């Protein structure tokens, strides 16, 4: 006799009137005229915003820093809308529309002569930030099929996560730091200036603690 | 991409500045060598090719 188990009920979950992802424009409504510096720190280090679920239960977690341009948004919008079930699923954007101006000089120009004109706009994304959040009358296995497909097409490392998997991922990392048998840690050595190591480290390494290098995030570092 | 023609000292003898564009469906051939840079030639060669093929579609 096969042993059956109860199934969860989604009758208490409401679906918005616009389950599909909204269109995202290349540029804001009012174009920007003040050119901005490169400001590479906007994709460096852990994300301090959009790091928690709001309405949905499934999302794409960013495992590294990078810029999203209008090409990536169209890839995300078209794939998710096509592969989702509007009657039981809904998707929302956890990242803003492209707003950071990017300047490109004319092809073949030598160095100098000022700064190039604005070419396109990008959205800076740090590691650990949700990009697209989904939810509704569905399981994680149903949406994991195409969310991972979208995740691997992003300029940064990404992975489809849920409320349970993300909590498990964070709790597993906390367990790794707790039972770490290595007497020496990056945080201890860097903060104490042991061996004069800060002469080769960065001031950001006091808070990154060796888990971040440039735009890259290393989950195996404790 | 091929080397241009003209009295232009050493730059042509090594630099493939001239650009030839061939539209396979129509067979039109557009060549431009006015500018020293290939990219500058390529853009104008495209623009002439666009204009010539603009007439062809009107003819089409």
């Amino acid at each position: 006799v096969k042993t059956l188990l109860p199934v969860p009920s989604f009758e208490d979950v409401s679906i918005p009137e616009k389950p599909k992802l909204r269109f995202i424009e290349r540029a804001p409504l009012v174009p920007k005229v003040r050119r901005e510096p490169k400001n590479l720190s906007d994709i460096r280090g852990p994300s301090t915003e959009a790091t928690e679920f709001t309405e949905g239960n499934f999302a794409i977690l960013a495992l590294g820093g990078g810029y999203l341009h209008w090409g990536h948004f169209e890839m995300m919008r078209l794939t998710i809308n096509r592969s989702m079930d509007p009657k039981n699923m809904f998707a929302i954007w956890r990242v803003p529309a492209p707003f950071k101006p990017i300047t490109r000089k004319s092809v073949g120009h030598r160095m100098g002569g000022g700064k190039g004109a604005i070419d396109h706009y990008v959205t800076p994304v740090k590691a650990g930030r949700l990009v697209v959040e989904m939810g509704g009358r569905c399981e994680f296995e149903e949406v994991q099929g195409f969310l991972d497909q979208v995740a691997h097409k992003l300029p940064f490392a990404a992975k489809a996560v849920s409320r349970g998997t993300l909590e498990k991922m964070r709790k597993d990392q906390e367990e790794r730091e707790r039972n770490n048998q290595n007497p020496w840690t990056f945080e201890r050595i860097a903060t104490a200036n042991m061996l004069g190591i800060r002469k080769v480290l960065s001031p950001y390494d006091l808070t990154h603690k060796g888990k971040y290098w440039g735009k890259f995030y290393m989950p195996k570092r404790v | 991409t091929f080397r241009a023609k003209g009295a232009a000292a050493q730059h042509v003898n090594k630099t493939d500045s001239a650009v030839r564009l061939v539209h396979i469906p129509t067979g039109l051939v557009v060549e431009c060598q006015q500018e020293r840079s290939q990219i500058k030639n390529k853009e104008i060669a495209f623009r002439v090719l666009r204009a010539r093929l603009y007439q062809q579609i009107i003819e089409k």
């Binding site: 004319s106 073949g108 120009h109 030598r110 002569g113 000022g114 | 020293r36 840079s37």
Partner: peptide, 18 residues
Amino acid sequence: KKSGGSSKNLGGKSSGRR
């Protein structure tokens, strides 16, 4: 060799006031 543009920002060469 292409002729490039020019910077439209002038001034701003003041020294520090100490």
